[PDB]
Amino acid sequence: NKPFAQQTGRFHTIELQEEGSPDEFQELLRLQASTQGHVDETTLARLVVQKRATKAILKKLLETADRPEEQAVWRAAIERLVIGNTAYDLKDDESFAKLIELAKKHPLEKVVKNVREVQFSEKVTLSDKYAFVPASNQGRIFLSHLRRENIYRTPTQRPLSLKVAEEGEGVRLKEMEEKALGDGALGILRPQSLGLPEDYTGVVQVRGELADPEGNVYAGLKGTVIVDPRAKEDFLNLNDLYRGDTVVDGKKYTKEEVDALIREKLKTGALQLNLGIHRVSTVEEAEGQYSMAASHTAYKELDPEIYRLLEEGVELDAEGRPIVPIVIGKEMAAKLGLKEGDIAFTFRNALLQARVAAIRDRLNAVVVNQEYAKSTGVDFDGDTLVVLPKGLPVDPHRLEVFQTLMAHAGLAVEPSPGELRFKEQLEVYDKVLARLSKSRLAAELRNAGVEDLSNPFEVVRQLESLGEEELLKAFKGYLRKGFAKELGLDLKSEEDRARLNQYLFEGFLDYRKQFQDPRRVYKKLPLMPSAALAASLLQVEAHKKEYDPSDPVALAAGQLTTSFLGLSEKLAQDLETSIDFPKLAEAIRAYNQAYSSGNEEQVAKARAELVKVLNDPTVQKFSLSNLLYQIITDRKKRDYSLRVRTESGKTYEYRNLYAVLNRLMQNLPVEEVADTVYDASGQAVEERVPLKQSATRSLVKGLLDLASGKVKEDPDGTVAEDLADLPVFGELEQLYGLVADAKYDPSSLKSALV
């Protein structure tokens, strides 16, 4: 309902972009289009984030001369401010006095127009949208800026307060494997303890913190919990909380160092958990219905049938479309007309075929194994799965297809077959089957309608399907004597005999209820040779780097550069209308076949065919489009870059993804907008970034005082044409101070700005 900053009180929040006012960053971004990609987006982003934030912090520092002890917290979001020639070290009671002095005597947009430098506190955490600063200086908040924005900017409803302790009544803090309850998941507590309607049974998405009476907060939490009355204690996994890795009072405290501090407070019974609910998992319609996704691993304890069910593999159907075990609720199973064993479909708000393996009375999640839906990138912090009925009015894609496209685009690589869930059992069965097929008993079976004896799950099914109890005792009795010999068990020894029925039935035959063909049910799904190929064709990857953690602009600057994820997505859709998915699919199926068991000529020819479909320009651009969308989405957290390795042998690094997106769009070569160029092994052959930066600060200065007449030149063929008639122009002028120092050769300005 409102930001967890405000529902908890930790931080004060000031907005960075005012009411409906124009996006000055979207405008600067067409300096990137005019220069054909030779300015630096994240520098443009910096100038904007420094302006927007300096203005906000002043305007607050003025509306807050009346609430004057609340002002003092905003004072220390800015250390030193250079306006004109005078410099204002706000820590001085002197300088600060003077700063608020001129603050009133001149209107805001003129004070900001003149700030030449600004340095922010370690205390202010800047983002694309807000400036957060902590409420009281008394305590200390042991998490990094990235995580404060992560945890505290989300809207949650009114925050609860739960006791943490190890013995007694409260919440307990186990120390298990990381992600042990699934990735986005960080705890299992009872519906009652966080105040939900009696015996709720689902998952709920929270934004909690872990604090003490004195105002120190040691870990913050972001993700979901699993609500369930069937579990005994309310417990949070500690290794899934965000703690440490930050600098309190000049020292970095590591994860490990803060984890020590918690165990010491926890023992003293002075450690709470302030938790805010953000969305409670209903089951609501979409046809189709959907709710949140839980990992089956968070059920080995409570309801281990669910755990063990989704643990025993996924089966590829006869056409290669994986069928994945899910577990749905009563409500859902109703409205969508499904019962145990029904094949449905599911996708995250790739479209996979689902096999219902269970139905529960009070469940309102959709519980899946995550390793088998990694192809729909399900994330157990809030992601929702949709289920559609058995009606199947669509074409669900093959494992090779998308697994091959996903790989061509750097988001998966070497051809491995799977791990068969039933490997050793099926070898035994094939040894026995040799003899069975020769026997009289096999003639009897084929006379009663069972022709193909190769699928034991089918022979047993098709039997009990049609009468034939005697032929079933005979088939079941045959395979006993068979496996017992095959495994050297003595069939008389009553504990050796219970070991057969343990191996043949309990471990093998009974799974005929979940799977259709044992020969196609996998423990580790395979990697099709076409996708290992597809990945060797494009050398595109998403290289990780953290935003400078010392400097609070880097992140907010970074988040502004995300603000065209729109165009990255239209590029994908507009692109995919072209690709003939028919021929893509056949060319892949050709290769994977001719790979597995094919002659030498075809493993040659199917290779050259698929390759020519994969090197097709519209395919390459489609896959490259898909990568960029992931990178841009991830730059909302880290300084990710694109890297590409070309026929030159060299690899190019990009963090100007808006120029990359334009070049892809207008079918221009993408290499000149690269930031750094590396030499095969050799690195740093060309570092283009420092040039691109001071160029940016020049062109901005140009664009600005060309549009305002301070340059006697023709603001006409240029991007300054009509700028000064536009609302956004009043905004851009508030960042003239930060680009004043720059210089530009006035002749070549008209050329740059066209």
Residue numbers in the entry: 327 to 612, 680 to 742, 750 to 812, 821 to 1162
Provide text from the study.
Many bacterial and eukaryotic viruses with double-stranded DNA genomes in the realms Duplodnaviria and Varidnaviria encode homologs of cellular RNAPs (collectively denoted “two-barrel RNAPs”). The TMP-fused virion RNAP transcribes pre-early phage genes, including a gene that encodes another, non-virion RNAP, that transcribes early and some middle phage genes.
Thus, the N-terminal part of the giant gp96 TMP protein appears to be a virion RNAP (vRNAP) that could be responsible for the transcription of the phage early genes. Several N-terminal fragments of gp96 containing the RNAP signature motif were cloned, purified, and tested for the ability to extend the RNA component of an RNA-DNA scaffold that mimics the conformation of nucleic acids within the transcription elongation complex of other RNAPs. While the shortest gp96 1050-residue fragment was inactive, 1200-, 1360- and 1540-residue fragments extended the primer. The structure of the 1–1200 fragment was largely the same as the structure of the 327–1124 fragment because most of the flanking regions not essential for the activity were disordered, except for two helices at the C-terminus (1125–1162). The overall architectures of gp96 vRNAP and gp64 nvRNAP are markedly different. In contrast, gp96 vRNAP contains no defined domain at the corresponding position, resulting in a clamp-less, flat structure that heretofore has not been observed for any RNAP. Gp96 is exceptional as it lacks the C-terminal region, and its connector element, which is disordered in the gp96 crystals (gp96 613–679), is twice shorter than in QDE-1 and phi14:2. The disordered region is likely positioned close to the RNA-DNA hybrid duplex during transcription elongation and might dynamically interact with the nascent RNA strand, moving similarly to the clamp domains of other RNAPs.
